[PDB]
Amino acid sequence: KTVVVTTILESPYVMMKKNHEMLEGNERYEGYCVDLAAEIAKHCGFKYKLTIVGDGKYGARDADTKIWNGMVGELVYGKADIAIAPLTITLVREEVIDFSKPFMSLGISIMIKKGTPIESAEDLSKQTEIAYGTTDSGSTKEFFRRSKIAVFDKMWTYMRSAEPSVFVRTTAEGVARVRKSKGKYAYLLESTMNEYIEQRKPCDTMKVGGNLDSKGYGIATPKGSSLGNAVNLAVLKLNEQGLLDKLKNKWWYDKGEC
């Protein structure tokens, strides 16, 4: 009956309201994906329950274990019926789960502490004084691991050998590292997140260079699930009606700080 929705606490997509301890159920959370979920549910006609991914990961197939983790894993192994969050549509994921057409565009980007002498991925690839890395178990790390493009492959080789580890468990960890490393740590995360944080206090970070790639987020369901078709059409419907646009403007600019 009730659709189990797996998501992740990632501002401004999903976050607990300040007064959450005084609320209940889905009302405890707020954000882009929270509004999106309510929209998808309404158009598809189902009741749902927002649940936070247990391991706090987006999703990757562990090397050796071969087991999928994160929101992808929850879908693959029967823990959730649908994933509504900033989950990147990728080849490896599409092979084990279904994705609706994209509801938002984005690209891998670089976040630096203001003043860091870096302007591009190429700049990063040429040196080591300023360490750089990305988040574990997601599409960004996989991108560098698989890229055959000169600059990116060099960066991957760099990351694997850099000490101490340049990888972080979460976006929060990555951003905190950038802010506390006095310009010696650059973080590779998606443009959506980079731009949001940039316009928020303490206004000490900034996106540099253009995006490294072009892709999108999609709503994911277990492979072959009957929910896919309806969900896919709803997303196209919301986009065509201009709702997804209003949603982004609301969560990315209607609340800016810097």
Ligand X SMILES: Cc1onc(O)c1C[C@H](N)C(=O)O
Q: Minimum CB separation from its own copies for residue 2, in Å?
A: 27
Q: Minimum CB separation from its own copies for residue 95, in Å?
A: 7
**By the rule CB under 8 A, 245 interacts with its own copies:** yes
Which tokens go with 7?
């998501």
- 139 known ligand binder: yes
**By the rule CB under 6 A, 193 interacts with ligand X:** yes
**By the rule CB under 6 A, 39 interacts with ligand X:** no
Q: Are 155 and 124 a contacting pair, CB within 8 Å?
A: yes
**By the rule CB under 8 A, 62 interacts with its own copies:** no
Q: Which of 48, 58, 143, 156 is in the footprint of its own copies by CB under 8 A?
A: 143
Torsion sign over Cα 78, 27, 250, 40: positive
Q: Are 203 and 193 a contacting pair, CB within 8 Å?
A: no
Q: Which of 7, 69, 90, 192 is in the footprint of its own copies by CB under 8 A?
A: 90
Angle at CA of residue 21, ends 17 and 24, nearest 5°: 80
**By the rule CB under 8 A, 249 interacts with its own copies:** no
Rounded to 10 degrees, what is the CA torsion of 14, 19, 22, 25? Answer: -10
**By the rule CB under 8 A, 242 interacts with its own copies:** yes
The residues, any chain, with a CB within 8 Å of residue 14's CB and separated by 6 or more, are 7, 8, 29, 30, 31, 32, 33, 34, 50, 52, 85
Residues binding its own copies (CB under 8 A): 89-91, 94-95, 99, 101-102, 105, 143, 146-149, 213-216, 218, 232-233, 236-237, 239-242, 244-245
Residues binding ligand X (CB under 6 A): 10, 58, 86-88, 135, 138-140, 171, 189-190, 193
